[PDB]
Amino acid sequence: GAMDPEFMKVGIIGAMEQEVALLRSQMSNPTTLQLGGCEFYQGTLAGKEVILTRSGIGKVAASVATSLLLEKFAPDCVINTGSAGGFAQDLHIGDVVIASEMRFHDVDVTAFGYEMGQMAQQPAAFPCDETLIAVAQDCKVGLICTGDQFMCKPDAIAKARADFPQMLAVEMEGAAIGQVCHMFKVPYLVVRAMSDIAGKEQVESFDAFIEVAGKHSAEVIIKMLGKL
Amino acid sequence: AMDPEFMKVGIIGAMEQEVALLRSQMSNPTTLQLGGCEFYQGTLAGKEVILTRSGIGKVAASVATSLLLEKFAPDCVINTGSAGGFAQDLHIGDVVIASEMRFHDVDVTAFGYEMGQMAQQPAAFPCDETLIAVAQDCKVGLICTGDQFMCKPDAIAKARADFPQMLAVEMEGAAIGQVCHMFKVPYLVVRAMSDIAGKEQVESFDAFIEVAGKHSAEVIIKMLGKL
Ligand SMILES: Nc1ncnc2[nH]cnc12
Ligand SMILES: Nc1ncnc2[nH]cnc12
């Protein structure tokens, strides 16, 4: 809207090909840069200058990709798109969650008095940018947690639910992207779509619906770009 | 020559206590602040080095290592610092040279990967065999990495059962190894023990982090004379 800040160069990150393929196919003559085991596609998409990033899976790869995206291309914000596992009551496959904030669910330095999920020298949560959140809303909103585990065992899900009763979904990169953006002081947002639901044949669900999750998340991003 | 030479050496430590001696023996270092990390360039014990203060944990170490590699392109990366000891005959102040790094907290085994193996990565990140030999001339084996301070009994027991040959744990080594794998750069992790599994690890850590970080860094300084 008129009173909102502007974002002239948009960085977009997805972990897997299934999460970036559609977005890439809608870019105009994209340049490709291979670096650090990641890929960066530079060009125009839905009327915006963007750098689309295929990061690889997990906290470390996401961190590499985001570091290089920021240091080499300096976008004005970062949007993470992709798939996630649903925890909240009324989530179904393909449903979209917009993160108001990211936390790590597997970080534990509580022995030194940090909150569960809080990394030393870091805030306990990484809030997504107030403008980006509202733009996504205009196109559920809440906490998504990140960890380097694919969560499908009853004990793991129960513990995560106990540590984070308000967690709506789980995935493997969003809070790493948020921490890197915090360290560079760059606005970010995470949008994810459910490829599987906690407790419900999650391996087979993920294999079957990763592509529809990646698609629904990417469609949201395309509409967001239309409004930035 | 035909010698296995590393001309520009990256060195990375998580905390001020792990890098302070190294920096203090550098000849008029230049300082750069980027991505929440610090990079000091200069000469040290005769060698061209970039010393990096990364911060704690996998994400911070990954940022630090990826910036170090892309902006400075060292010929090898050596990680130094403190760790928690699991091996039977390990004690406060003992040094461990990593043969390879693994993650103890990564679990995508539902998709067929080994325990500790992240999807799209190798199960383990072997340290460069030349760097290992140099370090030895100045225990050798597996160190595991996770984003947790391992002191609760059930967590120590799970890690021991998952990785029976794990000698020690810390919070950055395998991330550094993964980034170096992603960039194809040789690396090595060297740690000194600030605490031992099962033995008042919080108080031990606070009391021994300074001297353990110094001990590890002193190995590194020895190494740089022979590289
Ligand atoms: N169940 C799950 N756990 C972790 N990351 C996921 N991404 C999609 N589904 C997931
Ligand atoms: N017990 C421990 N767990 C994790 N990282 C450590 N670094 C030093 N001691 C440690």
Which structural domains are found in chain B, ordered by start? 1-227 (3.40.50.1580)
User: After which residues is chain B discontinuous, taking C to N > 2.5 Å?
Assistant: 138
In order of A36, A136, B28, B75, B178, the CA distances from B6 in angstroms are: 20, 49, 22, 5, 20
End-to-end CA distance of chain B: 13
Whether the CA torsion B163, A176, A210, A42 is positive or negative: it is: negative
Which among A4, A17, A19, A95 is annotated as catalytic? A19
Q: Is B198 annotated as a binding residue?
A: no
* CA atoms within 13 A of residue B16's CA, in its CB half-sphere: 1
Structure obtained using:
X-ray
Residue B188 and residue B186: Cα distance in Å, rounded?
A: 7
Contact B106 A36 (CB under 8 A): no
DSSP-derived 3-state class of residue A181: helix
CA A20 from chain center: how many Å?
A: 12
The alpha carbon of residue A191 and the mean position of all alpha carbons in its chain are separated, in whole angstroms, by 5
- Neighboring chain B residues of A108 at a CB cutoff of 8 Å: 147-149
Token duo for residue B4? 């296995």
Q: Which residues are A197's β-sheet partners?
A: A86
Residue A210 makes CB contacts below 8 A (sequence gap 6+) with A16, A18, A19, A83, A195
B13-40: buried (b, 16+ CB within 10 Å) or exposed (e) per residue?
Answer: bbbebbbbbbbebbeebeebebbbbbbb
Interface contact B59-A121, CB threshold 8 A: no
A163 to A118, A171, A177, B138: CA distances (angstroms) = 12, 16, 21, 45
Q: How far apart, in whole angstroms, are the C-alpha atoms of residue B37 and residue B16? A: 11
* H/E stretch holding B74: none
The tokens describing B177, both together, are: 């190894």
Helix (H) or strand (E) holding A141: strand A141-146
CA distance B213 to B82: 6
DSSP 8-state secondary structure symbol assigned to residue A119: P
- Cα separations (Å) of A218 from A19, A115, B139? 7, 33, 50
Lining ligand 1 with CB less than 6 A are: A 83-85, 150-152, 170-172, 195-196, 202, 206
Tally of residues, chain B: 227
Which residues of chain A come before a gap where C and the next N are over 2.5 Å apart? 139
DSSP B34-71: ETTEEEEEEEETTEEEEEEE--SSHHHHHHHHHHHHHH
Strand partners, A169: A86, A144
Q: What is the rounded CA–CA span in Å between residue B93 and residue B91?
A: 6
Quick one: tokens of B69? 């590699």
The span from the CA of B153 to the CA of A109, in Å, is 15
Return d(Cα B103, Cα A41) in angstroms, integer.
30
Contact B167, B96 (CB under 8 A): yes
DSSP A31-99: EEEEETTEEEEEEEETTEEEEEEE--SHHHHHHHHHHHHHHHH--SEEEEEEEEEE-STT--TT-EEEE
- Distances in whole angstroms, Cα of residue B168 to Cα of each of A35, B53, B107: 32, 22, 19
Kindly give the number of the ligand 2 atom that is closest to the alpha carbon of B171: 5
Strand partners, B98: B141
- Among the listed residues B227, B223, B218, B199, the one whose alpha carbon sits nearest the alpha carbon of residue B25: B218
Tell me which residue of B158, B149, B166 sits closest to B102, measured CA to CA.
B166
Annotation marks residue B195 as catalytic:
yes
The string of DSSP letters for B89-157 reads T--TT-EEEEEEEEESS-B-GGGTPPTTPPTTS-S-EEPPHHHHHHHHH--EEEEEE-SB---SHHHHH
B182 is in an annotated binding site: no
* Least Cα separation, residue A155 to chain B (angstroms): 14
User: From CA B31, how far away is CA B33, in angstroms rounded?
Assistant: 7
Q: Does B226 touch chain A (CB under 8 A)?
A: no
Looking at the DSSP bridge assignments, the partners of residue A34 are: A39
The residues facing B41 across adjacent strands are: B30, B50
If you take atom 5 of ligand 2, which residue's CA is the nearest one? Answer: B170
Residue of B18, B94, B105, B128 marked active site: B18
Tell me how far apart the alpha carbons of residues A50 and A54 are, in angstroms, rounded to a whole number.
13
Which 3 state secondary structure label does DSSP give A214?
Answer: helix
B-chain residue closest to A104, CA distance: B147
CB atoms within 10 A of CB A63: 30
A149 with B105: Cβ contact below 8 A: yes
Please state, in angstroms and rounded to a whole number, the distance separating the CA atoms of residues B33 and A195.
39
